[PDB]
């Protein structure tokens, strides 16, 4: 499945995984444009610390309210809200403590269901949940491999991880180089 790691733009690394362009970069995810932006939050969908703070503050109070409304309704493994004032069509709020491969698989499936092309996510779990960056990287990329292997990638064309700490970026880079053709 794996293509070659290159750097298309300063500080960005990319490689193909099947038909998907997988990219990683460091920086502030709230500045990104994508069909879906992922928020890594708590099981109450109301964390406002680290990247979740930035996402909820930029997205706005209407998204905060959509989150607590759905959180009240049933036990969710993740929730989908509007994008608020972020540059996306939907935010998918996943639980940072949850199995990362499972969370990314869910995000990919939801994006196919909406015929979306682009996804931007953080290094899910490496914030408040304190999952280890190496395991998180392995899980994210494994989820994308499985999705491609199953023939499920149709609308999804671009998956970008925008990562708050350059040191975590370095871990993702190493993982891509491990996998490259
Ligand atoms: Br991150």
XYZ file of C-alpha atoms and ligand atoms in Angstrom:
182
model
C 0.000 0.000 0.000
C 2.782 2.454 0.948
C 4.374 5.021 -1.329
C 7.378 7.212 -0.626
C 7.810 9.863 2.045
C 8.483 13.346 0.645
C 8.076 16.960 1.790
C 5.653 18.869 -0.548
C 5.711 22.057 1.481
C 7.941 23.304 4.277
C 7.496 21.183 7.456
C 4.954 18.883 5.853
C 5.681 15.228 5.113
C 3.481 13.081 2.925
C 3.166 9.599 1.480
C 0.510 7.649 -0.343
C -1.349 4.896 1.439
C -3.205 3.255 -1.401
C -5.157 6.073 -3.040
C -5.002 8.357 0.053
C -2.468 11.093 0.487
C -1.362 10.922 4.157
C 0.319 14.052 5.503
C 1.745 15.216 8.812
C 2.776 18.689 9.955
C 3.211 20.571 13.232
C 1.138 23.535 14.204
C -2.259 24.786 15.229
C -5.027 22.601 13.819
C -7.636 25.376 14.219
C -6.060 27.149 11.240
C -6.737 24.257 8.908
C -9.364 23.860 6.259
C -10.783 20.331 5.662
C -14.156 18.697 5.216
C -13.790 17.208 8.732
C -11.620 18.369 11.619
C -11.247 15.910 14.481
C -11.278 16.966 18.134
C -9.688 14.665 20.751
C -11.760 15.198 23.865
C -13.134 13.482 26.967
C -16.018 11.024 27.252
C -18.289 14.007 28.188
C -17.334 15.873 25.043
C -16.640 19.056 27.099
C -12.871 19.017 27.690
C -11.361 22.459 27.116
C -7.663 21.822 27.625
C -4.856 21.720 25.090
C -5.957 21.227 21.540
C -9.613 20.739 22.645
C -9.508 24.205 24.218
C -8.355 25.729 20.932
C -10.917 23.764 18.914
C -13.934 24.625 21.174
C -12.913 28.308 21.506
C -12.443 28.718 17.710
C -15.530 26.634 16.831
C -17.760 28.643 19.191
C -20.523 28.231 21.731
C -23.055 26.705 19.335
C -20.718 23.735 18.808
C -20.187 23.473 22.591
C -23.939 23.268 22.972
C -24.367 20.676 20.182
C -21.742 18.588 22.063
C -23.427 18.616 25.482
C -26.854 18.086 23.844
C -25.710 14.895 22.157
C -23.701 13.820 25.186
C -27.011 14.014 27.186
C -28.912 11.929 24.615
C -27.058 8.583 24.682
C -23.696 6.979 25.408
C -21.586 7.973 22.391
C -18.180 6.634 21.374
C -17.813 9.868 19.324
C -20.081 12.665 18.212
C -20.480 14.686 15.016
C -21.281 18.361 15.171
C -21.217 21.289 12.863
C -17.998 23.117 12.232
C -18.964 26.424 13.862
C -16.314 29.003 13.045
C -13.703 26.426 12.087
C -13.019 25.970 8.351
C -14.725 22.630 8.051
C -18.137 21.092 7.332
C -18.223 18.941 10.496
C -16.183 18.344 13.592
C -15.911 14.730 14.747
C -15.206 14.671 18.491
C -13.503 11.435 19.515
C -12.554 10.274 22.997
C -8.817 10.705 23.464
C -8.628 7.750 25.881
C -10.362 5.371 23.530
C -8.649 2.898 21.191
C -7.100 5.197 18.586
C -7.322 2.759 15.667
C -11.031 2.360 16.389
C -11.557 6.128 16.584
C -9.783 6.788 13.274
C -11.659 3.934 11.570
C -14.904 5.551 12.710
C -13.831 8.977 11.394
C -12.925 7.488 7.996
C -16.272 5.655 7.747
C -18.214 8.784 8.670
C -16.368 10.802 6.066
C -17.171 8.228 3.347
C -20.796 8.312 4.386
C -20.784 12.063 3.687
C -18.720 11.775 0.465
C -16.034 13.945 2.035
C -12.527 14.213 0.549
C -10.325 15.698 3.289
C -9.768 15.070 6.987
C -7.521 16.864 9.477
C -6.875 15.337 12.901
C -4.603 15.903 15.856
C -2.332 13.242 17.393
C -5.409 11.763 19.052
C -4.831 10.698 22.658
C -1.474 12.376 23.192
C -2.937 15.276 25.120
C -5.024 14.907 28.240
C -5.354 11.172 27.724
C -1.557 10.771 27.788
C -1.328 7.958 25.301
C 2.199 7.402 24.028
C 3.002 9.129 20.732
C 4.645 6.092 19.151
C 1.563 3.922 19.776
C -0.775 6.695 18.606
C 1.135 7.077 15.328
C 1.084 3.357 14.754
C -2.656 3.218 15.404
C -3.606 6.147 13.158
C -1.618 4.789 10.237
C -2.840 1.218 10.836
C -6.455 2.501 10.669
C -5.828 4.123 7.298
C -4.103 0.962 5.973
C -7.054 -1.203 7.021
C -9.563 1.178 5.432
C -7.640 1.127 2.142
C -7.114 -2.665 2.268
C -10.893 -3.197 2.672
C -11.519 -1.104 -0.471
C -13.408 1.493 1.577
C -11.497 4.571 0.364
C -13.673 6.082 -2.367
C -14.402 9.725 -1.499
C -11.590 10.153 1.066
C -8.448 11.406 -0.675
C -6.446 13.331 1.932
C -5.806 12.650 5.623
C -3.593 15.174 7.428
C -2.385 14.990 11.047
C -1.612 18.487 12.378
C 0.379 17.956 15.530
C 0.812 20.472 18.374
C 4.307 19.448 19.357
C 7.154 19.185 16.873
C 8.547 16.270 18.977
C 5.378 14.224 18.302
C 5.668 15.117 14.632
C 9.123 13.557 14.688
C 7.594 10.299 15.941
C 5.028 10.281 13.090
C 7.782 10.975 10.546
C 9.796 8.036 11.797
C 6.739 5.805 11.540
C 6.105 6.873 7.922
C 9.786 6.162 7.034
C 9.458 2.728 8.638
C 6.497 1.943 6.387
C 7.583 3.516 3.116
C 8.095 1.462 -0.034
Br -1.703 17.042 18.710
